[PDB]
Symmetry: D2
Amino acid sequence: SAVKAARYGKDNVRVYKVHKDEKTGVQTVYEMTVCVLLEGEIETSYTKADNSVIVATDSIKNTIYITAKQNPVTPPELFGSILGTHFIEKYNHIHAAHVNIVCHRWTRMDIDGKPHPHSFIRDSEEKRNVQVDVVEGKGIDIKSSLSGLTVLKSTNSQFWGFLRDEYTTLKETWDRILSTDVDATWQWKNFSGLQEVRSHVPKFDATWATAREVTLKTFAEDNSASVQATMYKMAEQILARQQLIETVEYSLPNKHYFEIDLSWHKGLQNTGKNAEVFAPQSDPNGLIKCTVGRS
Amino acid sequence: SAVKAARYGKDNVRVYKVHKDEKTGVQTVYEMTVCVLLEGEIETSYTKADNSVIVATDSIKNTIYITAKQNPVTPPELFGSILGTHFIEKYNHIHAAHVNIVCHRWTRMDIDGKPHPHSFIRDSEEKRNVQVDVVEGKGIDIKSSLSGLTVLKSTNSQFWGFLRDEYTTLKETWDRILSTDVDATWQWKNFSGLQEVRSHVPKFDATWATAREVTLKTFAEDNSASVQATMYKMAEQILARQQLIETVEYSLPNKHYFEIDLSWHKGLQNTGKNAEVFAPQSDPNGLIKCTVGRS
Amino acid sequence: SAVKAARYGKDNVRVYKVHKDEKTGVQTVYEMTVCVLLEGEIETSYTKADNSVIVATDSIKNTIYITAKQNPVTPPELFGSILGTHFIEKYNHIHAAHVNIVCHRWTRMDIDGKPHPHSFIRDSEEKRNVQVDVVEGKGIDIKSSLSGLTVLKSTNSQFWGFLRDEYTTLKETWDRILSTDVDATWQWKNFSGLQEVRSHVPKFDATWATAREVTLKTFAEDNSASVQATMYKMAEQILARQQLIETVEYSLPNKHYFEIDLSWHKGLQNTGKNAEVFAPQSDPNGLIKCTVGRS
Amino acid sequence: SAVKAARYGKDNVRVYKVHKDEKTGVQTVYEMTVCVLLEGEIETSYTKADNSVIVATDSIKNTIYITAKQNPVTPPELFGSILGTHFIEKYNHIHAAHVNIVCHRWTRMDIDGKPHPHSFIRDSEEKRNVQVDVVEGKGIDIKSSLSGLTVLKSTNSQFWGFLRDEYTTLKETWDRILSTDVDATWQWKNFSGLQEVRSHVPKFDATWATAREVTLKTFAEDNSASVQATMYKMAEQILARQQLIETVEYSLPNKHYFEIDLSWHKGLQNTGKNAEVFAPQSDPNGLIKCTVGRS
Ligand SMILES: O=c1[nH]c(=O)c2nn[nH]c2[nH]1
Ligand SMILES: O=c1[nH]c(=O)c2nn[nH]c2[nH]1
Ligand SMILES: O=c1[nH]c(=O)c2nn[nH]c2[nH]1
Ligand SMILES: O=c1[nH]c(=O)c2nn[nH]c2[nH]1
Ligand SMILES: O=c1[nH]c(=O)c2nn[nH]c2[nH]1
Ligand SMILES: O=c1[nH]c(=O)c2nn[nH]c2[nH]1
Ligand SMILES: O=c1[nH]c(=O)c2nn[nH]c2[nH]1
Ligand SMILES: O=c1[nH]c(=O)c2nn[nH]c2[nH]1
Ligand code: NA
Ligand code: NA
Ligand code: NA
Ligand code: NA
């Protein structure tokens, strides 16, 4: 037997960084959770108890905290590129650094209508994430994503004309609730290294905001033929509004709201056009996935 | 042996209600999770397999869905009063109905700056809750609450002058991070019945909003002497801005952000006034509780 | 306004203790999560920023770790009595200590059929808990519990003869699945202080084991007339097999497994006596509660 | 733009199956959660609102319930092969079926030492899983796994001799706690189709049990040089005890138990060889991964 593949590192490193402006007196906070896994010439650590090759996970932990000290933590695409680059450059035998970041929202608190200088709220559990892969020779791969964007529309969704057979029981419909948790991942064209990432920084924060805008706009206005149809439209536009994206990937669960028929009770009319009260379903859920690139 | 106390019912009933305005074309959605437990003359169901006394939990489930059909679901204080009242009036042997509601945020989506008529986002995991207890003879007790309000301030919190002894190691401080998840519960003066609840309805939605405003304002501006000091101030004001509240209760966990000392590394200065990067702590957490009434 | 009630302390203190036998070479591990909240003359900490009265939560954290060092951590009833007593005796102004412990299972690993001396598995997420309340003057109140005992029986449960009305749709049944997560809490007669707890120690571990045995035996063999009927029987016996219990409390959710009718598909027969495949329901759930004492 | 990749289906389908032996009177229960995603010629459903190509997720839900009715649900490798095969054979335009199953433990209850015929306990949250990929032309790929196996050893783990530099602070050690949640995935050599799966069935249940045995045995007895070293040894043996495995993959988080130094308190000695009481750490965690094949 032999080691086909190996990576190791530190997961779930919670990190908080405060930037204190002395002019304005205005503080800004950033909170991340960071994962770093390294690959390279480390298989002897697995086969020959050879720890000489192991950069301790604790040191990787340390290094995250240092790198966040010595460098900006935002935008995460950059921070992850920095942190990843660090480990391949620092260590001869480490040939890949895989950095995952989840950004937790700390939104400035409005007080009577005045951005408070040092108070924030977690205004949503919506996450911004990156997956940065820094590989010796092959530059830097970046996947940016938003996840946990939970939305619903009460009408202006349909689903009709789907295969019917001895396994079908679902009734065609022209009016229904559509609700989903949006997972939207855009993959950047490979960068040569840290310099090229540094040059594209403004596009990171800017493209994230666009993915969100588009997801929400499209979800809202599209008289959805299906989840399939509506997710494709979102992906179309993110590609079209930013050239450096090679691929957009949506994963959308269909959180079903069933009709409750209460006609058995004093002929009470709650289905079809008289549908008011629905039983939101926890499980099961449709899951719909799409990857979209350039033709 | 004997039954000292007994309640039963249906938990985790997810409920969704849509209100379709035909003038404006504008839809509004409400989503709840509801629990109902009944008490009364039911001990034989426990001791003598006497199911004659059991209003099936399934029927209670049905009844929730019906009551939401036939009545407004908002504000929850009212819906819970209605749903509770129903069961004590309907059934001779049921002498108490305990209704718990959690309201899940569906905020109208802004699109280019125009309230969309039928699209919503779950803009926070912050919950509005009620606990309605409807007891034959003793009218209606209501506890309204907000929970899951996660906040943080980077400065303008202190904690000094606390007991020191052979068990103390914590260093006094004049500048620190304070972060908490706010649990704020206000208890209404007993109502006589459903009529009196119905007459106080405008105060429900209005008092909730005030509890939130006050929690956020006070948390922000107060140069906190302690969590104790700051939570008391919040409770003070909620009492003072609404007469029908008998008691305000805060429960606040202290989510600690530890300083990371990186001086061992190239003399890097990250503590005291040079604190930038902190390790948010998952556990343990201070937990601080206060109930405040009228003197 | 005024402080009606106040408690504070440290929550979620994870604690691990190893006992190294030097004769046998055999190690034993205990892992807890501990919460301590104190009451007493502390209201000035809330009203007058008077921190002099606050035993820092950090020190309480320290004290837990010390007390576990200097004392046995098992059984939890005792550890909690010790830890609680400590704080009322040590501090003049602290008049109550509330200690909550959750014990996490570390079961010795069997290897070829030989208790390994230092390897363990978390063989279930079933928790043993205590709630110890140590109050100056009023001795020590103890509530012991088991929670998270997830069980199911495929048959030998029924539910018929329950109220039917214009809110009922549930069909009587003589054969069904019953599945629940067992919450069983037994309350000890008040102890005078730490000495009396110390004298009743053997009964703690011994009564816990009995509550479990009884819960499982009774759940299994009882042709349940209802959840009500079956939980009462369990409580009956725990009371009857240990004299120092004043009250037994069960909370049992009814995790429903619905029949799936597949007759619409090639006349496939899956209901009634031909029921094989069921859809386990996540929500809603019946919730059934009973407190049982001595008549 | 164009659809690079697409799959859709039903997730989180909870499924329960009872087998009633009429001879013995002995019932046996199986509970799964199932996910099915299909690929094939479905891109028009995304681009042209062409629902004709969509096998409704609801029908896929139905099909799972039927397939479990008409076929054995155990072992999951087989059930998943059956369920996957079904969809590629049934539908001309569906070219791949991806089936994920999680098996939830229902262990027969021992009562006085007699396997009860119809009562079971969820004796662990340890999961058995499969990932079955059924692709038109390319037969059936199966990944079997165990996850959520939470273990700990108090001693007989070490970690010394690892790279040290200006980022290192971790102290070498010869005695420490090692604790992890085991994720062990074994990948089967490709099968031609359902017949070949059917012929290898006895090996499925049998290889799972071996992966568990080996994981536990090796974890226990190995004086671990590192997590790396110990996971490799486990993988080695699973490969060596079953020929049809092509690759074994372990993912092991290192759940750290920190030493608490209590010397500041009455010179209390709790570090090094006097370590008794430790603070289990929730985060961060080392994460260690290895894939092992045949050289
Ligand atoms: O948008 C949808 N896509 C689907 O594939 C589907 N299946 N059931 N409902 C559905 N809705
Ligand atoms: O309201 C429902 N809609 C559905 O699509 C469905 N499928 N099974 N039961 C159902 N109920
Ligand atoms: O606000 C606080 N109150 C307390 O009681 C405490 N203890 N440690 N830190 C603290 N902060
Ligand atoms: O930064 C810290 N602050 C604290 O209050 C504390 N208590 N133990 N370790 C600690 N670290
Ligand atoms: O045991 C039960 N008790 C109940 O009260 C009930 N209601 N529906 N099913 C039930 N089962
Ligand atoms: O199988 C079912 N059993 C029930 O008790 C029930 N109640 N609503 N739908 C149901 N389905
Ligand atoms: O087994 C280990 N492997 C590692 O790579 C490591 N790093 N810190 N501790 C560790 N333990
Ligand atoms: O006890 C500890 N062990 C460690 O490996 C470590 N790393 N930071 N703090 C620590 N404490
Ligand atoms: Na390198
Ligand atoms: Na009544
Ligand atoms: Na005292
Ligand atoms: Na096909």
